[PDB]
Design a protein around this ligand. Structure first.
Ligand SMILES: CC(=O)N[C@H]1[C@H]([C@H](O)[C@H](O)CO)O[C@@](O[C@H]2[C@@H](O)[C@@H](CO)O[C@@H](O[C@H]3[C@H](O)[C@@H](O)[C@@H](O)O[C@@H]3CO)[C@@H]2O)(C(=O)O)C[C@@H]1O
Ligand SMILES: CC(=O)N[C@H]1[C@H]([C@H](O)[C@H](O)CO)O[C@@](O[C@H]2[C@@H](O)[C@@H](CO)O[C@@H](O[C@H]3[C@H](O)[C@@H](O)[C@@H](O)O[C@@H]3CO)[C@@H]2O)(C(=O)O)C[C@@H]1O
Ligand SMILES: CC(=O)N[C@H]1[C@H]([C@H](O)[C@H](O)CO)O[C@@](O[C@H]2[C@@H](O)[C@@H](CO)O[C@@H](O[C@H]3[C@H](O)[C@@H](O)[C@@H](O)O[C@@H]3CO)[C@@H]2O)(C(=O)O)C[C@@H]1O
Ligand SMILES: *[C@@H]1O[C@H](CO)[C@@H](O[C@H]2O[C@H](CO)[C@@H](O)[C@H](O)[C@H]2NC(C)=O)[C@H](O)[C@H]1NC(C)=O
Ligand SMILES: *[C@@H]1O[C@H](CO)[C@@H](O[C@H]2O[C@H](CO)[C@@H](O)[C@H](O)[C@H]2NC(C)=O)[C@H](O)[C@H]1NC(C)=O
Ligand SMILES: *[C@@H]1O[C@H](CO)[C@@H](O[C@H]2O[C@H](CO)[C@@H](O)[C@H](O)[C@H]2NC(C)=O)[C@H](O)[C@H]1NC(C)=O
Ligand SMILES: *[C@@H]1O[C@H](CO)[C@@H](O)[C@H](O)[C@H]1NC(C)=O
Ligand SMILES: *[C@@H]1O[C@H](CO)[C@@H](O)[C@H](O)[C@H]1NC(C)=O
Ligand SMILES: *[C@@H]1O[C@H](CO)[C@@H](O)[C@H](O)[C@H]1NC(C)=O
Ligand SMILES: *[C@@H]1O[C@H](CO)[C@@H](O)[C@H](O)[C@H]1NC(C)=O
Ligand SMILES: *[C@@H]1O[C@H](CO)[C@@H](O)[C@H](O)[C@H]1NC(C)=O
Ligand SMILES: *[C@@H]1O[C@H](CO)[C@@H](O)[C@H](O)[C@H]1NC(C)=O
Lengths: 160, 324, 324, 160, 324, 160
């Protein structure tokens, strides 16, 4: 999206990764599989969770009865009351509508950004010890058993 | 050997809208628009409402013969009128400051109906047994409101009456009354004798004096005569004094109530079941968790801002792009 | 051999403001603030307004002799008063609930002016040919409103009159009338004889009774006497009854109208041409495409929220950085 | 801007590219010229177009007459009506004003982001087969005729 | 040899909230919520307010004997009532359109108190020296308002009085007056003789006629009688005419004022010191620099939108992450 | 954050850099010290300064008296007036609250973005003449005296 990762240089989602939002998928002589990057996932959950609460928690409301009842000689204020009701409800309708649109954009970008950062966190460690195949993958110029695969997952990949 | 960094995907079909794209499938979303209700009239903050049914507020307070079931009313957080609430002022006339009263009585903590001016010996040397009409007929028979008393001339003399009441109930007292207006000054006399009668109501905070407003007018649900209904809230320790030489529809039963905070009047035919809620509407109870609601512009309580939206879904997960 | 990836640039000079920078030149922009108008008074949703010109609403409805051109009024979506609309109640007095009436008649589907109480034989044994004044002078001569009739004492006797009207027009009927108030109780008699006269107006929804309010008061545009103008909307099938022993300025012509939805009254001197529109203002027609307008706080129709902004330009293209 | 491309490492605009917002400019032994990247341009148009509609389409409004008319003994409600009119018009003025400011920021960033992504899409294909001259250009370490120039434009550049 | 690119950090402990994280320490922040005040009642735009102290608006205008210090009032941008402003209508009664008047007089440019109807010879052949009551007692003695005059029957005859006044002050004139209502028609005569008296007030824009509304009512702070207070703004060049056969509490002193724009009435016990301000509140002066305020929902002037927030801190610097 | 620099690949702040928001810290045989990048700092100040003014300057307000005073038979409009006051104050409370939350996010991201751009501006010049140590530092593959350190600071680093 804004950061190129989702539906970008990493064009597809992993139906097989079922324990997180962002993660890896290794492939070596011993086997293969997915593993969600736990730290970036939790942090992403905490943030979104916090974002959703904000949008909700920040809505103040007091006890109120909107209805009014005015007789046939109070059209002026009945209409004034109408202007108020239509009025606020025209404000909350434009705000809710846009708040979601804009925040939805932000959220998706946030995810995209988290992926790019993850991809980059790894692209940093491997350096020349791997070639980049523009699909979000790295092919090691050496053997990388499960310990090795692990080290890069928990960002502790040796001499690069 | 290889390692790829990627993102989640699933069977989700929830879609959200963004500034740049319409309908984007997402792995996880959350709804911010409450658009469901239990189609029931609940209790607002643990306090059942007041059902009037066939009766409307005016009929309930005045004592319309069709609201006998409402003579025990007690507490209530909001009032419920039905599409069948047409039984109010059986005897034609104007209910002064009616809306205002409806508004003020929307919510009541305590509410006791007492006999302020006992029919039995309260107006001796005055006819208190003919105050009945066909408009306010009870079971075929002619009757009258149950909280007001239609005092009429005794024999052929209508002596000036006088009666006071002091609020010692230790709380506001709602005092309702009326003034009858004959269609002709010929009736003004065959009923109240004095063709120059007046009705005055005094209080430390009241003084509006009345005179009969005779005038040839169309007959409504029978009678061509009219009755204007009045009311006032008598403060603790204050005294309300009535004196009249005719046309007085004296208070019989008044109410000793306790208003704290004000709410409103819901008009709906939804069933009234025993459920609780913070925000109530005409179609039913609404949830107060989400920031927005689209169930009904008219609500009572702590409600989610009413919006003309049909969809306010917020993304939480990321774009959903499966396929293996 | 080389290849560069870059971005567009052109001769554009449109500038937009951003959170971080003021006036940023952009290649392509779009305006969201409508600030132009056709300086004309159009039709609101395909229905021309009502021009009163020199006359104001009161003069138009009452029948001021200077509003003879307005006796054919028909339909209209909103009313237009001019800076020259000063011809209303030529005869001094208070137009009861005037604003309220203006508001209610802002929009009308059908509107027919009919003779409710024919001047010719309607008040026999009553003088109906002297009801004329210098304040309401028509072409040098003394005259009076064209929809009301000034009934005055016959010979030296003013017998109690009575007259009713039932709305069989199949739609609301606007019934206007007045009550004259002499400056002295000496005139109250030389005009209506009975120095204790009254005017009562009855309806299934009306009963206000009147008495002459004699009082020494300053002379306005001539007369020291006054005339309070009243009105009421008579529901289909209902009957309005007038009876009076003096001071009655009887309804002569009433209006059978059809209100559906309410709009308002525009006051402006802009020309009224045949154009259409969804949103109209005092300066002219405004466009309803953009979310905001800064042409006029006061509008009628479906309008763009009024803002104190002068510039709400939104970027569409990118920063413009030319030069070769 | 936020992504470095516009008025950044690619400091100028191409007055010569007149068929799109983002694109290229090749230079080889056969000739030279500009070519707008059609996909990223269309997508950018669609998005902005959609963004503009949203800001407009989302504005709900009902038939209304703002004016009121109150007599000299209705100053209290005339002022109440005033508070309402000033009130809403103080809300829409602050909202429109800021909505544009913030959305204008977003839009410009969006363009900047699209350029960086494009530049990067290419920088990815060429790899070592070209040297990066920090002005948004790439000089091939080999000959790149029009077919070649084409391949990189439509992202199908051979062995890198 | 090495070179690192990094960012600033300091001893700051200011924290701001973000969409994703609560309490984030920042190097530099700015507050957008004004929540402090000088706990003083200042001048609104360089024009001191009007202090009534023990007196409320009604007592000040009518001339309650306890507001003698307020007889010199001049200019003021807003009015101040205290928790001790209980001295108003010492003599029981209803102040007609009181709120409306309070609202209209909230702000006044020029304001001069003049003798409109001189007590000394203005009502000859009428008793103007007994108009005194125990309710309006001045220093133990019985007194009365200082701007109204209680005219009472002379000897045993109360001849019809008449008096006019033309506004030649070149500005609006506030004319206050009252109508006394005895508790019994027995007193109506021992005071005004005519047991059918009336009080009429005429103007080119006024005509409301009054009659005594006798009625047995409770005694308030002594008297069982009542006095309704009225008022009107007399336009330049217009003439107000009073005529009455009893019950008139004639205007003695009126005010020639100059209203330009309207403000309001602050009710607070905070000290009134000589300070200036654009926005004022009951707790004190508030700053008008920030977009938001949480000091008080009720304000007067050009104020920062009131919010229920306690913290609206905006980041300017970046995340603060020190430690060496 | 969104751009990886702050509390990211450059995990800490420089308490020692006291003349700007973003800058450097060199280390060579002659000495060491911090130096704020003046251009990116000023520009960042100007922008934030402008952002703060906007949020303030854009708040329109007219002279007004919120209070009203209605007698015991004007409960309906007193409540109408209440709905208006609660009403607007429910709007400004949700707006201020969120405007700050969202703008605070934007501001922090902006700083993070400025750092990443700076880091990248340098990473561009040095190229192979230095190795990247994922902590925001570059170790030259050669000697870099104060002139040299200077050149890279003011972006004029020679043959790379
Ligand atoms: C006085 C009392 O206690 N209630 C009677 C009322 C009141 O007199 C009336 O409401 C005062 O405004 O009237 C009741 O109905 C009779 C009354 O309407 C009179 C009209 O004065 O007409 C009677 O019916 C007439 C009918 O109109 C004639 O055409 C003919 O049929 O004779 C009958 C009998 O007179 C009404 O019965 C009422 O119900 O309110 C009777 C109450 O007792
Ligand atoms: C009664 C009728 O049909 N209309 C006449 C009205 C009404 O009497 C009046 O409006 C009731 O309030 O009065 C008209 O004008 C005359 C009237 O104002 C009388 C005052 O009672 O004065 C006449 O003028 C006087 C003048 O004031 C004297 O100084 C002197 O010049 O004599 C003349 C003649 O009397 C008014 O002409 C009116 O136009 O409304 C006359 C209507 O016919
Ligand atoms: C008329 C005048 O100038 N002011 C007198 C007023 C007015 O008469 C009164 O307000 C009209 O509504 O009355 C003053 O007080 C006396 C009055 O209230 C009368 C009642 O009519 O009672 C007097 O007190 C009585 C008391 O009630 C008896 O129980 C007994 O003690 O005798 C005394 C004396 O009559 C009040 O003094 C007033 O202060 O307003 C007197 C004014 O002069
Ligand atoms: C109770 O309400 C009913 C109507 O809701 C009143 O009766 C009226 O309604 C009838 C149809 O159900 C109509 O035919 C009449 O208008 C009228 N009927 C009668 C009784 O005359 C009824 O009067 C109300 N109860 C009272 C007496 O107030
Ligand atoms: C029609 O309106 C005019 C004013 O708009 C009325 O005439 C008045 O205006 C004159 C100036 O044009 C002033 O000199 C007077 O106040 C007055 N003139 C007259 C006729 O006395 C005019 O009366 C209105 N028509 C009527 C009779 O209602
Ligand atoms: C001035 O105000 C005071 C009260 O604020 C009036 O006096 C009343 O207050 C007393 C307590 O201070 C109570 O005991 C009484 O209700 C009453 N006292 C008197 C004087 O009877 C006082 O009357 C006011 N001044 C006037 C005359 O209007
Ligand atoms: C969607 O997938 C989840 C996880 O496997 C499963 O629980 C659910 O039943 C599935 N529903 C559908 C749409 O098949
Ligand atoms: C999904 O696609 C478009 C969005 O504009 C529309 O035609 C359709 O109704 C949308 N339905 C959903 C998923 O709400
Ligand atoms: C701007 O450029 C366009 C495209 O060449 C052209 O149509 C237009 O006339 C030019 N206008 C100016 C400002 O010269
Ligand atoms: C352009 O530059 C500044 C913006 O603040 C100002 O002086 C000038 O009026 C602006 N004019 C435009 C292009 O609207
Ligand atoms: C914070 O640091 C500044 C700069 O050194 C200094 O002026 C101030 O006194 C310090 N305050 C604290 C919290 O010690
Ligand atoms: C800081 O941390 C949390 C924020 O939610 C809270 O417990 C605490 O009160 C906050 N205090 C500050 C710095 O305002």
């Amino acid at each position: 999206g804004l950061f190129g990762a989702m539906a970008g240089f990493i064009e597809g989602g992993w139906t097989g990764m079922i324990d997180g939002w962002y993660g890896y998928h290794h492939q070596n002589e011993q086997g293969s599989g997915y593993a969600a990057d736990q730290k970036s996932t939790q942090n992403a959950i905490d943030g979104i969770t916090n974002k959703v609460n904000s949008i909700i928690e920040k809505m103040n409301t007091q006890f109120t009865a909107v209805g009014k009842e005015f007789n046939n000689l109070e059209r002026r204020i009945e209409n004034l009351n109408k202007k108020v009701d239509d009025g606020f409800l025209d404000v909350w309708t434009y705000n809710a509508e846009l708040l979601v649109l804009l925040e939805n954009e932000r959220t998706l970008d946030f995810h995209d950004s988290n992926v790019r950062n993850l991809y980059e966190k790894v692209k940093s460690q491997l350096r020349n010890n791997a070639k980049e195949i523009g699909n979000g993958c790295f092919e090691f110029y050496h053997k990388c058993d499960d310990e090795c695969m692990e080290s890069v997952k928990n960002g502790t990949y040796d001499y690069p | 050997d290889t390692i790829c960094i990627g993102y989640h995907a699933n069977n989700s079909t929830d879609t959200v809208d963004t500034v740049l794209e319409k309908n984007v499938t997402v792995t996880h979303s959350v709804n911010l628009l409450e658009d469901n209700h239990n189609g029931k009239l609940c209790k607002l903050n643990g306090i059942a409402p007041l059902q009037l049914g066939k009766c409307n507020v005016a009929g309930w307070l005045l004592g319309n013969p069709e609201c006998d079931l409402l003579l025990t009313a007690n507490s209530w957080s909001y009032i419920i009128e039905t599409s069948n609430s047409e039984n109010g002022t059986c005897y034609p006339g104007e209910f002064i400051d009616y809306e205002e009263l409806r508004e003020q009585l929307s919510s009541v903590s305590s509410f006791e109906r007492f006999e302020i001016f006992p029919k039995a010996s309260s107006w001796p040397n005055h006819e208190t047994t003919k105050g009945v009409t066909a408009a306010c007929s009870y079971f075929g028979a002619s009757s009258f409101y149950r909280n007001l008393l239609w005092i009429t001339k005794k024999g052929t003399s209508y002596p000036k009456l006088s009666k006071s009441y002091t609020n010692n109930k230790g709380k506001e007292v709602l005092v309702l009354w009326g003034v009858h207006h004959p269609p002709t000054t010929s009736e003004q006399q065959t009923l109240y004798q004095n063709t120059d009668a007046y009705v005055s109501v005094g209080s430390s905070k009241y003084n509006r004096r009345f005179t009969p407003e005779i005038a040839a007018r169309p007959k409504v649900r029978g009678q061509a005569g009219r009755m204007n209904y009045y009311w006032t809230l008598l403060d603790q320790g204050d005294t309300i004094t009535f004196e009249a030489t005719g046309n007085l529809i004296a208070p019989w039963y008044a109410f000793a109530l306790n208003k704290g905070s004000d709410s409103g009047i819901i008009t709906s035919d939804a069933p009234v079941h025993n459920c609780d809620t913070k925000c109530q509407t005409p179609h039913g109870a609404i949830n107060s968790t989400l920031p927005f609601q689209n169930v009904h512009p008219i609500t009572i309580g702590e409600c989610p801002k009413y919006v003309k939206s049909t969809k306010l879904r917020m993304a939480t997960g990321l774009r959903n792009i499966p396929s293996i």
